[PDB]
């Protein structure tokens, strides 16, 4: 009946380039409630507005989040031309969309901090012939080429990935560069909403109240 | 089995600066990061910096950030270290090596498996 | 920074006999350790990475062990040519820290 957004307030979450992805459907949501647990510090949306995306009903809805500094929120924009964009994490656009950059309070210990923040800074395939690069543009919907190269906290800034691929990968190597960002004093996340409506498979519909 | 080939002896006096080059010779960087490392005469050796040719990124010891700057032109695959304020103690031969083992943590650090001839940087009045 | 205590810091032996040479991280660092010799007027030669793994066409008498802080370069049976400086080094933060050295004469 109602929709479980449980496994996001356990655990530590996972760096931008590894985002984990809930799907609902046929069940109700709180959005408010959720919100209501952290401190919202940014919320804006594509092709939809925030008061509708807590009140609408959906086919299915799609929850990504992720540790995210608030510092790079300009970075977390397809307008920009910013890594994050291009080879970590990118939401869809026949889709309507929503953005939510959130503090976690203290009393909300469940929540557990990881060691730093760190994204994806370059991601390509170096070809066999030992001269041309080929950028790995991240797609929507999408994990990064690279998160196979890229551990899931990178522990030096600019630290450098490389692995040689065999004649049936295409050869040559999958090269990558991460970046760090000191973590701050409370973890701060990002979480990316993507909805779809249907015709009549639309079920994914807002926690109404009663008496 | 490629070579690193340095450029010539270097004196200088205190206070200027010096650019060693490290080209590769009957191959290429391929996706090898490349380091630079110092040793002073009857001393050991100092890791100084390090840089990954394909993205151009580059990382420094904190004892000669300010005073270093390790670049490579990938177009010809040789790598550079430029020593700005040269003093006294900066006299020591100056090695380029490649990282050819990535360590646990990543591919720019890791063991050097070829190393160049060294060069020569002698500060003095 | 990860310091590296390389001892001892100089030894002399004969021609044949058995050599230790040990490191010690002031942290763990795993297995990302490397050991080189070096010879007078020469650039350093790498003779063995990720602690253990002895580079192609280095001699089977350089054996290097140990995982986590100590670690330790131990020679066989000392050839003519093994008598060099041998150097220690962590491959696993920055900076990349090398150890003090060691010096191996020969005994006479």
């Known amino acids: 009946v109602e929709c479980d957004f449980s496994p996001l307030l356990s655990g530590t979450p996972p760096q931008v380039y590894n985002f984990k992805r809930l799907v609902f459907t046929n069940c109700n949501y709180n959005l408010t409630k959720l919100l209501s647990l952290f401190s919202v510090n940014d919320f804006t949306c594509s092709q939809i507005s925030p008061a509708a995306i807590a009140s609408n009903c959906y086919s299915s809805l799609i929850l990504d989040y992720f540790s995210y500094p608030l510092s790079m929120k300009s970075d977390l924009s397809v307008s920009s031309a910013g890594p994050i964009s291009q080879f970590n994490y990118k939401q869809s656009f026949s889709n309507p969309t929503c953005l939510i950059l959130a503090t976690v309070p203290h009393n909300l210990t469940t929540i557990t901090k990881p060691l730093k923040y760190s994204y994806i800074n370059k991601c390509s395939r170096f070809l066999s012939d030992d001269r041309t690069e080929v950028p790995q543009l991240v797609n929507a919907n999408q994990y990064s080429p690279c998160v196979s190269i890229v551990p899931s906290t990178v522990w030096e800034d600019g630290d450098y990935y490389r692995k040689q691929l065999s004649p049936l990968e295409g050869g040559g190597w999958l090269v990558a560069s991460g970046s760090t960002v000191a973590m701050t004093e409370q973890l701060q996340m990002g979480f990316g909403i993507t909805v779809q409506y249907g015709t009549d498979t639309n079920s994914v519909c807002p926690k109404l109240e009663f008496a | 089995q490629v070579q690193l080939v340095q450029s010539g002896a270097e004196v200088k006096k205190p206070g200027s600066s010096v650019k060693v080059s490290c080209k590769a010779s009957?191959?290429?960087?391929?996706?090898?990061?490349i380091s630079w490392v110092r040793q002073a005469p009857g001393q050991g050796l100092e890791w100084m910096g390090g840089?990954?040719?394909?993205?151009?990124?580059?990382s420094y010891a904190q004892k000669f950030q300010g005073r270093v700057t390790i670049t490579a032109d990938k177009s010809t695959s040789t790598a550079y270290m430029e020593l700005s304020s040269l003093r006294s103690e900066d006299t020591a031969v100056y090695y380029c090596a490649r990282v050819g083992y990535c360590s646990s943590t990543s591919c720019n650090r890791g063991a050097f498996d070829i190393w160049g001839q060294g060069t020569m940087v002698t500060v003095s009045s | 920074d990860i310091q590296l205590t390389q001892s001892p810091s100089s030894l002399s032996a004969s021609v044949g006999d058995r050599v230790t040479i040990t490191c010690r991280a002031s942290?763990?660092?795993?297995?990302?350790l490397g050991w080189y010799q070096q010879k007078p007027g020469k650039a350093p030669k790498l003779l063995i990475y990720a602690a253990s793994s002895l580079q192609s066409g280095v001699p089977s008498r350089f054996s290097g062990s140990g995982s986590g802080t100590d670690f330790t370069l131990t020679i066989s049976s000392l050839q003519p040519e093994d008598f060099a400086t041998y150097y220690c080094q962590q491959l696993n933060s920055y900076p990349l820290t090398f150890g003090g050295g060691t010096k191996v004469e020969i005994k006479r």
């Open positions: 840089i990954i040719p394909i993205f151009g990124t580059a």
């Open positions: 942290q763990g660092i795993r297995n990302d």
């Open positions: 009957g191959g290429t960087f391929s996706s090898y990061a």
